[PDB]
Design a binder for this molecule. Sequence first.
Ligand SMILES: [Ca+2]
Ligand SMILES: [Ca+2]
Ligand SMILES: [Ca+2]
Length: 249
Amino acid sequence: SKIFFEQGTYQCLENCGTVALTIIRRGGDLTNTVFVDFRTEDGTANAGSDYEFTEGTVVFKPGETQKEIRVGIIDDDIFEEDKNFLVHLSNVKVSSEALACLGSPSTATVTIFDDDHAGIFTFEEPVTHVSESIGIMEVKVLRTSGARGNVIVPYKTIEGTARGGGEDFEDTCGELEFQNDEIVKTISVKVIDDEEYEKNKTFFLEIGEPRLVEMTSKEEEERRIAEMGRPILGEHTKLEVIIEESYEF
Ligand SMILES: [Ca+2]
Ligand SMILES: [Ca+2]
Ligand SMILES: [Ca+2]
């Protein structure tokens, strides 16, 4: 009798390649032979660009309340904001081999989350404490908001009350190479033991501007939003390293 959409709202990723939506019959009749016509309407997302066209008929054989439809999701590499498109149910039968009914929701809203932000690069903490022991130390550099593309993130150590050159820490410079879909990377810095106490030895580890490696009204804002999917620095671009002393014994 009543036949409608499981979830009034769906969501997916642009690279999902496709998105499954489920339809149901509530009751008011048993079985069998009910089929529902579905089709996609455009929201802020358009067919042929953000997704694929999607119309067909769904057949209900006996003893079943669950059928799924699948809409193709078009993927490219151009950063976009979130966009939506609708899927409508219509023309219920009426086997004749009845009357209505629509049911609710007869339409679903699919949200396509984009996966082309080159990422925001940041340290996890503004300050870290480490003992003189432990020699080398691992420092994670994060890529958030997106993993798309090969990004190069430069870094270096800045001498504080703690001196480098082989006194307190061993100077380190270079650039981390973030592969596509890759998120985390560690920086190794050599902390050495002093025959000497001193106090609160502080030195810094900084990351520079990231950059990626080589190889109409709507279209304009579309290309402007695209320029916002480039690699940028995050909340913490500089790490202060405090060194704890002792414990002799
Ligand atoms: Ca898209
Ligand atoms: Ca994409
Ligand atoms: Ca895209």
